[PDB]
Design a protein around this motif. Structure first.
Motif, PDB file in Angstrom:
ATOM      1  N   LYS A  35       0.830  -1.195   0.000  1.00 28.98           N
ATOM      2  CA  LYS A  35       0.000   0.000   0.000  1.00 28.98           C
ATOM      3  C   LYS A  35       0.865   1.245   0.000  1.00 28.98           C
ATOM      4  CE  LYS A  35      -3.692   2.715   0.572  1.00 28.98           C
ATOM      5  NZ  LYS A  35      -3.701   4.211   0.647  1.00 28.98           N
ATOM      6  N   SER A  94       2.051   1.791  -3.506  1.00 25.30           N
ATOM      7  CA  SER A  94       0.903   2.356  -4.194  1.00 25.30           C
ATOM      8  C   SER A  94       0.794   3.851  -3.961  1.00 25.30           C
ATOM      9  CB  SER A  94      -0.363   1.657  -3.709  1.00 25.30           C
ATOM     10  OG  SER A  94      -1.525   2.360  -4.094  1.00 25.30           O
ATOM     11  N   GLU A 109       1.542   6.948  -6.929  1.00 22.77           N
ATOM     12  CA  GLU A 109       0.497   7.911  -7.248  1.00 22.77           C
ATOM     13  C   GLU A 109       1.002   9.332  -7.062  1.00 22.77           C
ATOM     14  OE1 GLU A 109      -3.295   7.326  -5.429  1.00 22.77           O
ATOM     15  OE2 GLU A 109      -3.981   9.353  -6.027  1.00 22.77           O
ATOM     16  N   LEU A 113      -0.416   6.423 -12.305  1.00 17.90           N
ATOM     17  CA  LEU A 113      -1.579   5.763 -11.718  1.00 17.90           C
ATOM     18  C   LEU A 113      -1.731   4.313 -12.121  1.00 17.90           C
ATOM     19  CD1 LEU A 113      -4.639   8.181 -11.723  1.00 17.90           C
ATOM     20  CD2 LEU A 113      -3.341   7.315  -9.814  1.00 17.90           C
ATOM     21  N   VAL A 114      -1.169   3.869 -13.253  1.00 15.29           N
ATOM     22  CA  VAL A 114      -1.333   2.451 -13.578  1.00 15.29           C
ATOM     23  C   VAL A 114      -0.630   1.580 -12.548  1.00 15.29           C
ATOM     24  CG1 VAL A 114      -1.929   2.471 -16.005  1.00 15.29           C
ATOM     25  CG2 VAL A 114       0.430   2.873 -15.318  1.00 15.29           C
ATOM     26  N   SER A 146       0.429   2.566  -9.454  1.00 16.03           N
ATOM     27  CA  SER A 146      -0.104   2.797  -8.120  1.00 16.03           C
ATOM     28  C   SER A 146      -1.369   1.991  -7.910  1.00 16.03           C
ATOM     29  CB  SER A 146      -0.409   4.273  -7.914  1.00 16.03           C
ATOM     30  OG  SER A 146      -1.495   4.375  -7.012  1.00 16.03           O
ATOM     31  N   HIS A 147      -2.187   1.878  -8.956  1.00 13.67           N
ATOM     32  CA  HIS A 147      -3.383   1.048  -8.895  1.00 13.67           C
ATOM     33  C   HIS A 147      -3.022  -0.436  -8.884  1.00 13.67           C
ATOM     34  CE1 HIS A 147      -7.783   0.601  -9.551  1.00 13.67           C
ATOM     35  NE2 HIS A 147      -7.447  -0.465 -10.250  1.00 13.67           N
ATOM     36  N   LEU A 182      -1.998  -1.140  -5.338  1.00  6.26           N
ATOM     37  CA  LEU A 182      -3.191  -1.128  -4.503  1.00  6.26           C
ATOM     38  C   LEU A 182      -3.975  -2.420  -4.643  1.00  6.26           C
ATOM     39  CD1 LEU A 182      -4.661   0.131  -2.501  1.00  6.26           C
ATOM     40  CD2 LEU A 182      -5.838   1.539  -4.186  1.00  6.26           C
ATOM     41  N   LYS A 183      -4.094  -2.942  -5.871  1.00  5.67           N
ATOM     42  CA  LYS A 183      -4.689  -4.263  -6.063  1.00  5.67           C
ATOM     43  C   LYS A 183      -3.912  -5.332  -5.295  1.00  5.67           C
ATOM     44  CE  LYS A 183      -5.578  -3.654 -10.597  1.00  5.67           C
ATOM     45  NZ  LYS A 183      -6.299  -3.733 -11.909  1.00  5.67           N
ATOM     46  N   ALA A 227      -2.055  -4.815  -2.567  1.00  2.00           N
ATOM     47  CA  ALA A 227      -2.281  -4.584  -1.144  1.00  2.00           C
ATOM     48  C   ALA A 227      -3.634  -5.103  -0.718  1.00  2.00           C
ATOM     49  CB  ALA A 227      -2.187  -3.099  -0.816  1.00  2.00           C
ATOM     50  N   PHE A 228      -4.646  -4.939  -1.573  1.00  2.00           N
ATOM     51  CA  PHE A 228      -5.977  -5.450  -1.257  1.00  2.00           C
ATOM     52  C   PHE A 228      -6.015  -6.961  -1.291  1.00  2.00           C
ATOM     53  CE2 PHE A 228     -10.488  -4.694  -0.834  1.00  2.00           C
ATOM     54  CZ  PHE A 228     -11.030  -5.931  -1.248  1.00  2.00           C
ATOM     55  N   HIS A 242      -9.916   3.315  -9.272  1.00  2.00           N
ATOM     56  CA  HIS A 242      -8.921   3.430  -8.213  1.00  2.00           C
ATOM     57  C   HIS A 242      -9.530   4.058  -6.977  1.00  2.00           C
ATOM     58  CE1 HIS A 242      -4.694   3.586  -6.828  1.00  2.00           C
ATOM     59  NE2 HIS A 242      -4.920   4.826  -6.426  1.00  2.00           N
ATOM     60  N   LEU A 245     -11.365   1.279  -5.257  1.00  2.00           N
ATOM     61  CA  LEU A 245     -10.408   0.346  -4.667  1.00  2.00           C
ATOM     62  C   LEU A 245      -9.812   0.927  -3.387  1.00  2.00           C
ATOM     63  CD1 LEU A 245      -9.347  -2.288  -4.877  1.00  2.00           C
ATOM     64  CD2 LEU A 245      -7.474  -1.450  -6.242  1.00  2.00           C
TER      65      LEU A 245
END
Ligand code: CL
Ligand code: CL
Ligand code: CL
Ligand code: CL
Ligand code: NA
Ligand code: NA
Lengths: 5, 363, 359, 5, 359, 363, 5, 5
Positions: free
Chosen positions: C323, C326, C330, C335-336, C338-339, C342-343, C345-346, F342, F345
Motif C-alpha cells: 500500500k 501504491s 500515485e 496511476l497504472v 499505483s493502482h 493497490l490491487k 495490497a488489497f 482506483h 479500490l
C-alpha cells in the motif's frame, strides 16, 4: 465358637 | 511358604519414615531389606507401587539423581505426596490387622479410605475393599451392628456387576457370621442358605465349605444337634479343608458336638485328629480347646479344664471362652453339681463383660 | 533450544509406550546431559521425574508388568504426563510457527489444569499468555488481547511477577497496534514504559521504544517515530539480536520516506549485513524493496521481492508495504502502477485470515 | 510491519 | 416437638411430588404458624425456603410445567431438598427410637455433605454426633466413641462451640462407662467437669455429677457414688425433668444397697410419684423391683417387673439388675434363685446386640 | 409477534440489581413489568427459572415472607447465589448480542460459561450451547479462526449423540460461512456440500435452504457466476424463505448476480422484489443495498452510489462495504474509468482496515 | 443403668 | 456479502 470366613 | 505381605508393608513404612528424617543409613538398610523380599512376598500390586514411589523419593533425598537435581517441590510432588500418604496408611492398617490390633487397624483404614476419595478415577471396587476390611475388623472385636453396615456397603457395590460374584459372596459370609454371633439364629439360617445356593450355582468350593460349617454353628447354637452334626460333616467332605488351618474349626466342632451327644465313641476320633492338626499348625488355641474336651469328657479334671480355659482368656478369646464356660455350666447342671455349674456360669458372664470392654487401648 | 529438549522428552514418552527399552534409554541420558546445564525450567525436570517413574514401571526392576495398568498410581501419573506431553508438543509447534496446532495442544493441556492438585494461578497465566501469543501471530487480535489480559491480571497480583506482567502488556500493545487502535496502543505502551523503567528491565524497555516507533510511524509523526527507533537502537543488546533487524529496517524505511536518503542508505547497508549474519531471507527481501524503490528504481525487482514475501505468507506486511508503494507511485503521477500495487495490497488483506496451515 | 515482543 | 415439624416439612415434600396442590398448601401454612415461634433451627426454615421454591415451580404462577424437569435449578435444589429430607427423616426415626433406620437416614444425608457449596465443618460435627449417639443407643460403643470424638475435635476449634464440645465429651464418657472402662470414664468426666464449670452450664454439670455417680456405683465406692447422685439432685431443673427419674432411682437403689432402708424408701416414694407424673412405665417397673426386693420381698413379683423390662428390650439394664439380684440371693445363702437370676442376667447379655429392629 | 426474549432478560437483570440495592419501589415496578411480558415472551425455560429465583429473593428482602423470617444467609443461599449469578451473566450476554455489541456479549458469555462448570450435573449440551454462542459472536466481528474453534467444539459435542442432529447441522452452517469469509473457497465448497447431504438425508428444510444460498455465495466469490445463479434459485425454491427477512439476502444476491452478467432484464425483477421486502421488513440495509444496484446498473449516479454506501459504513457493515466497493472498482476498470476504479479500490481497502479495528470498545 | 446425656 | 445461518 465364632464362625469361619 | 511365602512371607506375609502385611509384614513387608511394615518395612516400606519404616523406610518411608527414614526418608523424611533424611537418614541415609537406615533408609538404605531398609531399601536393601525390602528388595530382597519383594517377589517372595505374597504378590500384591499395591506393594510394588508403594516401593517404586518410595524408591524415587529415596533418589531425590540421597542419590541426587546422580548429583544433579532440582529442589524437591515441583508439580508432580503434590500427586506423589497423596499416593504415598495413602499407601502409608493402608499398610499401617494391614500390619495392625495382621497383629490383631483391630482398633488401630480401623483407625488407619479409615484415614486411608478418606484419602482414596481425593485420588482421581479410583474405581468403585477399591471402596468396597475398604468397607469390607473395616467391617471384618469390627467383627473381630464383636461390633456386629457396624460390621454388618460396612460389609453390606461393600456387598452393594460388588453386586452391581457380573465380574465380582466371588467378592460379593465373601461379603455374605461375613454378614452371615455376624447374624450368628448376634444370635439372630433364624435370620442367619435363611441368610446362609441363600448364600449356599449362589455358591453352588457358581460352584465356589471354599465359600460352599464355609457356609456348611457356619450352618453347622447355627444349629449347634439352636440346639439342633443332629442337624448341626450333618452339616459339620458336609463341610469336612470338602477335600481342601483338611489341609487348611481353618479345618481345625470343623474337626473341633465335630468332636465337641459328638461328645455333647452320647457318642464318646466317634468324638474321640476327632479329638485325636484335632490334637494332631493342632501342633501340625502350632495352634495353641485348638490344643487348649481340645484338651478342654478331654478333661471334660475323657478322664475328667476340672482343675485342668479351668487352666486351659485360663489360657484362652489370656489370649482374649472372650467370645469363645464365654460359650465354652456356658456349656460347662450346663453340663454340671445336667449332672446335678450346681455349685460348680454356678461357678462356670459366673465365669461365662464375666467373659461377656470383657467382650464389651474391648481388650485394646483407644485414643 | 529449550523447545528442542522438551521435544526429546516427548520422544522418550513415545518409545516407552512402544515398549522399546533401548531407544528410551538413549533419550533419557541425552536429556540428563542436556538437563545438567541447570538451564532453568523445572517443568522439563518434573516431566523427566514423571517419565522415569513410568520408565521404571515398564522396564526396570519389575518382574511382572501384567499388573501395571491396574496399578493405583497409573491414574495420577497419566494425567500429569499427558499434560506435560501436550504442553511441550505445543511449545515445539509454536517454535515451528504452526500456530493453529500449537493452540490445539496448549488448549488440551489447559483443560487438565483444574484436575491437578496444587497448581496455583501463575500456571494459568502461562497458558493464557502462550495461547494468546499464538492467536496473535495468526492475527486473531480480540481473543489475543483477551487471553493476555487475563494473564496480566494474574501476574499483576505479585511483585514477584512484574517482568511477566510487563511482557503481557507488550503483547496487548502490539495487538492494539496491529488493529490500528493507534491511540490506545500509544497510551498502553507508555504506561508499560514507566514501570519497565522503574525495574530497569533492558529488554522490555528496548521493545516499547521500538513499538512506540511503529505506532507514530503508522500515525504519520515521522520525526517522532525516528526518535524512538534510535532510542531502541541505543540499547546495545538489540543490535546483536536478530530482532534488531526490524528496527534497523524501520530506520532505513523511515529515513527514505523523509528526505534523508544518505543516512537511510547507511542503515540499508547495515540491514543487508545483519541479513547475511542471521540468514534472514525475509529482511533481505524487505531491504531489496527499499533499494529498488529509493535507489536504482526497478518496479520489476520490487515486484519480485514482494512476491517472495507473499510466498512466506507474511500477508500483513505485504499489505502495508504494497500500500505504501501504491501511495508513492500515485504521488509520482503514475496511476497504472499505483493502482496495480493497490490491487496487490488489497489481495494481501484478503489473505491475512486464510490461515496457511491445515486448521 | 508487525511489532516486536 | 422439633422432630415433629421436621416431619411435617417432609409430608409437604411428599404431597408436592404427588402433584396434589391442596394437601401441600395446608402443610405449608401449618409449618409457617409453627415456624413463627422463632423456635431456633434455621434448617427448618431453609428446608421451608427450598420447598416453597419447588412448590412455586410445580403449582403456583407457572403456565407450563412440562419444562420443569429440564430446568437448570432442578439439579441444585434436588440435592439440598433430598439432603434435608434425609436429615429430618432421621431426626424423626431417632425420636421414635428406631436407631438403625435413623443411622441409615443420617448416613444418606452425610454423603451429600461434600457436594454442597458452603457447609463449613460444624455441619460435619452434627452428623458425627447424631450418628454416634444412635450407635451408642444400640450399644455399638467403639464406633460411637469414634464418631463423637470426631465431633468434639471439630467443636474444640471454636470458643463459640464450647457447649457442643462438652456435650460430645459426655457421650464419650457414658460410652466408656457402658464398656466398663470405669477408670477412663472417671478421668474423662472430671476433665469435662472442669470446663463445664468454667462456663457455668447448669445442665451439663448436673449430668456429669450423675454419671460420676454411676461410675463409682459400678466401681463399688458406694458412699462416693451417693455423694455425687445428691450433687446432681441439687440442681433444681433436674427434679422437674423426666431425666431426674434416673438419679432419684439410683439414689433409692444405692441407699437400699447400703444399710439405709428408711431414706431409700423416701426416694422410692418420690420415684413412684414422678413415674406417674411422666407416665414412665420403665421406672415404675424399676422401682417395683426395689420394693419387692428390699421391702416386702416377693421373688415372683420381682420376676414380673424384670419380665416387663425385657419386653421393652432394655437388655443392658436387665442384665445388670438381674446380676445384682443374683448377688443378693447368694449372699442370703439361697443358691437356686441366685443361679436362676444369673441365668437371666446371662441371657440378657446375649440379647444386647440382637437389635430388636428390622436392620 | 412475540416480544424478544433477550429484552425480557434485560429487565430481569435490572430487577436483580434493584434487589441488591434493597430498593422496594424499583424492584416492584420491574416485578410487575416482567410478569406482564413473561408468557408473551418467546418461550424460554431459562427465563422462567431466573424469574422464580429473583421472585424468591424479592420476598426475602421486602415481603418478609409475611413479616416473619430469618436473616438471608443459610444453607440454600450459596446454591441460589451461583444460579442467580449464572443467569445474570447469561442474560447480560444475550442482551448485548441482541444489540449487536458482540465484544461485550463475549465477555458475559465467557463469565457465564465459567460459572456453568461450578453447577452440579450440567449436562454437556449446555456447554455446546455456549461454545456456539461465543463462536457466532466472534464470527459477527470477523474473528474467523477462533469462531471455527468454538463452533467445532460445540459440533464435537452435538455429534456425540443421535438426538442433536439438527444442532450439529447448525454448527456446520457457521463453520461453513467462516471458511467462505476466510476466503478458503475450495474447502468451504466441500464443507457445505457435505452438510447438504446430511441436511437432505434428514430433510431439514431451513438448513438445506441456507446451504444452497451459502453455496451460491461461494461460487459468486469464485467467479463462477452461472453456477452461483443456479444455487441462488435453488434456495429461493424453498417456500418459507420468501417470508423470512433472511430472504432479502437471496433476492438481493439474485439481483446482484444477474446484473453482473448482462441480464439487466431479469435483474430488475429481483430489484423490484427486493425493494419491496426491504420496507416490508423495514430493512434499511437492503434498501440501501438495492439502491446501489439501481444507481449502478439502472440510470447510473456515482454520487448516489457513494452515499448509500456511506450509510452502510455508518452501520459498520465493513465486510459488506469492502466487497461492494471492490465490485464497483472492477466495474469502472472494465469500462476504462480508472480514476474512479482506483477511487473505489481505495475505499474497499479502507473498509478492510476497519474490519480489523473492530468498531466497538474494549476494556 | 445407662448414663444420662 | 456475509453468509446466512
Ligand atoms: Cl486511532
Ligand atoms: Cl527477546
Ligand atoms: Cl476399670
Ligand atoms: Cl437434657
Ligand atoms: Na432371630
Ligand atoms: Na482454499
Amino acid at each position: 465358637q465364632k464362625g469361619m470366613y | 511358604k511365602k512371607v506375609p505381605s502385611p509384614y513387608v508393608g511394615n518395612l516400606l513404612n519404616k523406610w518411608h519414615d527414614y526418608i523424611m528424617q533424611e537418614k541415609v543409613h537406615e533408609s538404605i538398610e531398609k531399601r536393601t531389606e525390602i528388595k530382597q523380599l519383594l517377589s517372595q512376598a505374597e504378590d500384591n500390586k499395591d506393594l510394588v507401587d508403594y516401593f517404586i514411589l518410595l524408591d524415587h523419593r529415596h533418589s531425590l533425598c540421597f542419590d541426587q539423581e546422580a548429583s544433579m537435581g532440582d529442589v524437591v517441590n515441583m508439580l508432580s510432588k503434590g500427586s506423589h505426596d497423596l499416593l504415598i500418604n495413602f499407601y502409608f496408611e493402608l499398610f499401617a492398617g494391614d500390619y495392625e490387622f495382621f497383629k490383631k490390633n483391630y482398633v488401630k487397624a480401623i483407625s488407619f483404614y479409615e484415614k486411608a479410605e478418606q484419602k482414596l476419595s481425593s485420588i482421581p478415577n479410583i474405581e468403585e471396587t477399591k471402596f468396597a475393599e475398604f468397607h469390607y476390611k473395616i467391617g471384618v475388623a469390627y467383627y473381630e472385636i464383636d461390633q456386629h451392628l457396624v460390621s454388618v453396615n460396612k460389609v453390606t456397603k461393600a456387598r452393594d457395590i460388588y453386586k452391581k456387576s457380573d465380574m465380582w460374584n466371588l467378592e460379593a459372596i465373601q461379603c455374605s459370609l461375613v454378614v452371615g457370621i455376624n447374624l450368628y454371633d448376634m444370635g439372630r439364629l433364624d435370620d442367619a439360617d435363611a441368610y446362609f442358605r441363600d448364600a449356599l445356593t449362589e455358591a453352588l450355582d457358581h460352584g465356589y468350593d471354599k465359600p460352599i465349605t464355609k457356609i456348611y460349617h457356619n450352618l453347622g454353628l447355627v444349629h449347634w447354637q439352636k440346639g439342633s444337634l443332629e442337624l448341626a452334626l450333618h452339616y459339620f460333616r458336609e463341610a469336612y467332605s470338602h477335600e481342601w479343608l483338611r489341609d487348611s488351618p481353618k479345618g481345625q474349626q470343623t474337626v473341633y466342632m465335630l468332636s465337641r458336638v459328638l461328645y455333647t451327644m452320647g457318642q464318646n465313641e466317634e468324638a474321640y476320633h476327632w479329638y485325636e485328629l484335632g490334637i494332631e492338626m493342632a501342633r501340625k499348625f502350632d495352634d495353641h488355641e485348638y490344643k487348649a480347646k481340645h484338651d478342654i474336651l478331654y478333661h471334660l469328657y475323657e478322664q475328667p479334671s476340672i482343675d485342668e479344664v479351668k487352666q486351659s480355659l485360663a489360657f484362652l482368656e489370656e489370649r482374649n478369646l472372650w467370645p469363645d471362652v464365654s460359650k465354652i464356660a456356658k456349656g460347662i455350666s450346663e453340663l454340671y447342671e445336667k449332672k446335678g453339681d450346681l455349685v460348680t455349674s454356678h461357678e462356670f456360669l459366673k465365669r461365662a458372664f464375666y467373659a461377656k463383660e470383657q467382650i464389651q470392654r474391648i481388650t485394646e487401648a483407644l485414643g
